[PDB]
Structures are given as structure tokens and as C-alpha cells.
Amino acid sequence: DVTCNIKNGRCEQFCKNSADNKVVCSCTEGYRLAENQKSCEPAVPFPCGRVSVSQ
Amino acid sequence: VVGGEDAKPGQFPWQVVLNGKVDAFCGGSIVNEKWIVTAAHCVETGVKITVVAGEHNIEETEHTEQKRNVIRIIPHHNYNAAINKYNHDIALLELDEPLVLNSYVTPICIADKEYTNIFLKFGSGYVSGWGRVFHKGASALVLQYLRVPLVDRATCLRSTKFTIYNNMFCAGFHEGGRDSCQGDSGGPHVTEVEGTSFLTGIISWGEECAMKGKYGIYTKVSRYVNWIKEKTKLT
Ligand SMILES: Cc1ncn(-c2ccc(C(=O)N[C@@H]3[C@H]4CC[C@@H]3N(c3ncc(Cl)c5c(N)noc35)C4)c(Cl)c2)n1
Numbered sequence: 001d002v003t004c005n006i007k008n009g010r011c012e013q014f015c016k017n018s019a020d021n022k023v024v025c026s027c028t029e030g031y032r033l034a035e036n037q038k039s040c041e042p043a044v045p046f047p048c049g050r051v052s053v054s055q
Numbered sequence: 056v057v058g059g060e061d062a063k064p065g066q067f068p069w070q071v072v073l074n075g076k077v078d079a080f081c082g083g084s085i086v087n088e089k090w091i092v093t094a095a096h097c098v099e100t101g102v103k104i105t106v107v108a109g110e111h112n113i114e115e116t117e118h119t120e121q122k123r124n125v126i127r128i129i130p131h132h133n134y135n136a137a138i139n140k141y142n143h144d145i146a147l148l149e150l151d152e153p154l155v156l157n158s159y160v161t162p163i164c165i166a167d168k169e170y171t172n173i174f175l176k177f178g179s180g181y182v183s184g185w186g187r188v189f190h191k192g193a194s195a196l197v198l199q200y201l202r203v204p205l206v207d208r209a210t211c212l213r214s215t216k217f218t219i220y221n222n223m224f225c226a227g228f229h230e231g232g233r234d235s236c237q238g239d240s241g242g243p244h245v246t247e248v249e250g251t252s253f254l255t256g257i258i259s260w261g262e263e264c265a266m267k268g269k270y271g272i273y274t275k276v277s278r279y280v281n282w283i284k285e286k287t288k289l290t
């Protein structure tokens with residue numbers, strides 16, 4: 001029950017199906033794949049698509 | 056934008072405004088520090104264009120604004136205004152000097168072709184701009200934004216006499232009262248993915264803003280991702 005078509009493989013941004021019924025997550029430019037293997041963390045001062053000013 | 060709300064400062068930090076003989080004639084989105092993506096019909100005449108990033112209230116000189124001159128215009132290679140002003144309606148603007156990225160001046164993310172299309176399929180995006188706030192009404196002063204749902208293809212085809220190709224999508228409301236409008240063209244349609252916004256469309260056109268039974272027409276960005284990434288690559 002771990003595939004990119006089910007809840008995006010639990011990947012925050014992108015998912016790729018990999019060997020042995022596993023997935024490999026990934027992120028857009030300016031983010032790094034986090035230690036939990038799913039989340040995307042900023043890797044630059046002003047990553048794309050993020051609201052940083054207090055709302 | 057008709058039926059929208061005022062953005063807060065820095066809520067859409069990828070938004071830009073295009074100014075010329077009239078102000079706020081179109082919008083755009085920041086791809087990176089040197090490149091803006093917009094609609095090709097906004098920039099067909101090749102007249103001088105000023106881009107303003109970090110804008111909020113277009114009638115108040117504030118401190119986050121970064122004004123830049125456009126040094127080159129790259130309409131998509133398949134755009135041909137002599138045949139159809141709104142097909143392949145996308146263009147890239149090169150800035151004279153780089154933007155300084157900050158909390159008010161931030162690029163929009165652009166996924167690959169497959170994921171940009173998946174994100175459009177989520178069915179709900181945000182549009183923003185300084186376009187008219189009523190059909191044939193005044194332009195906005197404070198940036199406006201609006202969440203618009205994706206409309207099914209058959210419903211949109213019946214809503215207009217003009218042809219809608221597969222590189223375009225429709226979004227908006229059956230009841231009307233909420234839509235993009237003149238002056239918003241070229242701006243962003245974005246989809247929020249776990250707190251990160253991705254560019255899913257370019258605001259293109261419509262016939263009567265926010266009229267019941269009419270919808271806003273948008274360019275699908277997924278078809279142009281590879282070209283954006285190639286043309287705007289800085290490394
Ligand atoms: C062959 C073809 N395909 C599209 N065509 C077309 C035909 C007519 C119009 C047109 O005159 N639309 C009017 C004119 C003032 C208000 C309407 N308008 C709009 N511009 C931009 C936008 Cl984003 C909108 C919108 N969502 N509703 O109306 C809009 C500009 C437009 Cl923008 C495009 N013609």
C-alpha cells in the first residue's frame with residue numbers, strides 16, 4: 001500500500017516509484033528532502049513558492 | 056479581479072505588475088531573479104515595459120518595490136498573434152538587472168510537466184492581480200486575490216462562441232460574481248501544495264468579467280514547463 005498513486009507516496013512534493021514496493025520522494029529547486037524521507041525543507045534563503053512575511 | 060479580497064503584503068511574493076502607457080495593464084510571475092513569465096498578448100507590440108516586483112498598492116510608493124526594465128521579450132516559438140492572439144499565450148521577460156530576492160520578492164515554483172498537470176487536477180487555484188474590480192470598472196489599487204475552481208471542459212465550451220484548445224483551461228463560478236478581469240492577464244494561477252505554491256496557469260482572457268454563465272480562460276503551464284526552464288536557466 002505504498003505507491004505514488006496513493007496519497008502521493010506520502011511525499012510532500014514529488015514521488016517516484018522505486019524498487020521493492022518503495023517510493024523515492026523529492027522536491028523542487030531550493031528545497032532538500034528531509035530526514036523523514038518525505039518532507040521538503042528550505043535549502044536557500046528565499047525558496048520558491050513560500051510565504052515568509054507574517055500574515 | 057472581481058469578487059476577490061485584498062492581499063496582505065508579501066502574500067503573493069511572486070506577483071509582478073507590468074506598466075507601460077497605462078499602468079497595471081497586465082500581470083506576471085517571477086521565475087527567477089532575471090526572468091518573468093507573462094501572457095504573450097500583453098507584450099506583442101514590443102513597446103517598453105517596466106516590471107515592478109514587491110508591489111502592493113500601485114498608487115502608493117512604498118519600500119518593497121523593485122522596478123526593473125525589460126531588455127528582452129521571448130514570446131513562445133508557437134505564438135502567432137496574426138492567427139490567434141490567445142493560443143500559446145505565454146512569454147518570458149528578461150530583466151535589465153537582477154531582482155534581489157526577499158520575503159516580498161520570491162519566485163513561484165515550477166514543477167515538471169507531469170506534476171504541473173497533477174497540481175492543476177487538484178481543482179483549486181489562486182489568481183491575483185491589479186485588474187478591474189468590476190466588469191468595465193476601475194482597476195484595483197491593492198493587489199486582489201481569488202480562489203477559483205477548475206471547470207469541466209464541456210461546460211466551458213458551451214459558455215463561449217470562441218474555440219478552447221487543450222492547452223487552455225477554464226476556472227471560475229457558475230453563479231458569476233468572481234473572476235479574473237482585464238488588467239489581470241499574464242498573472243499567475245497557482246496551486247498550493249502543502250504550503251508551497253506552484254504555477255499551474257497563466258491568466259489569459261475572458262469575454263465579460265464575472266458574468267453568470269461565463270468563465271475565465273487560462274493557459275495550461277504544464278505544456279510550457281520545459282521551455283520555461285530552458286530559457287530562464289541561469290547556470
Ligand atoms: C478568437 C478569440 N479567442 C479569444 N478571444 C477574445 C475575445 C474577446 C475578448 C474581450 O474583448 N474581452 C473583454 C475585454 C474587456 C473585458 C473582457 N476582457 C477580459 N480580459 C482579460 C481577462 Cl483575464 C478577462 C476575464 N476573465 N473576463 O474578461 C476578461 C477584455 C478577449 Cl480578451 C478575447 N477571441
Ligand code: NA
Nearest residue numbers: 112113115117
Ligand atoms: Na506601491
